[PDB]
Amino acid sequence: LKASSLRALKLMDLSTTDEKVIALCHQAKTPVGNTAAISVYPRSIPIARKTLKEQGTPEIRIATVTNFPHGNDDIEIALAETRAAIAYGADEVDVVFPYRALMAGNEQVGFDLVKACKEACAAANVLLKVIIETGELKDEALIRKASEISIKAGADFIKTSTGRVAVNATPESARIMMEVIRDMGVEKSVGFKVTGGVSTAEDAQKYLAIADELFGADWADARHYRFSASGLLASLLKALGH
């Protein structure tokens, strides 16, 4: 549990005014190590970057969100937001997939939206995570389909949830998404991010165990696995004696 907690902490995209962003940056530099990233809205990226540099943790990544949390199907808007995130200085952009469009039978727009965002990101050496909103898709077949489309369009990560709807990650939706990664043969190039549904250290251990069982215990490094959830960092630190 201590070993799993330390591992999970170093895979966290930590999310919470400039004062609150600065405090977030401070909290990411924990007594047992740095989180993988902090996650902020685009406008907060410059002050976050300044703070991370000033505290001597320039390798903590800055992730942000676009097309968020709605997952609308206007590609030009999602692309504009993604380009702005890049311009602000993001290391990673988590875009919301147009899941409502998929539920209405339109697979193509999801492909096109992800691909457009990925092209912009790749040009700037920025990682793209795609949020498929498993809690709105609900159905296993639709979760697989959104995952497949996202990967085909060049997602660097597939992410469960925005954290802004009633139902976020579950172990089953995590398993389904990681099975897609495995089944498609893309475990080298595509990571998985769990958002929500991971309150405690014990929860984090269970989610890591799924990855370990599917891929082997070395797979879930920071390029391949991330966590974000309210309260999780505090629970991990408690498990570790802080």
Ligand SMILES: *C/C=C/c1ccc(Cl)cc1
């Ligand atoms: C998946 C990322 C969610 C999120 C929400 C809110 C902020 Cl500020 C950043 C990231």
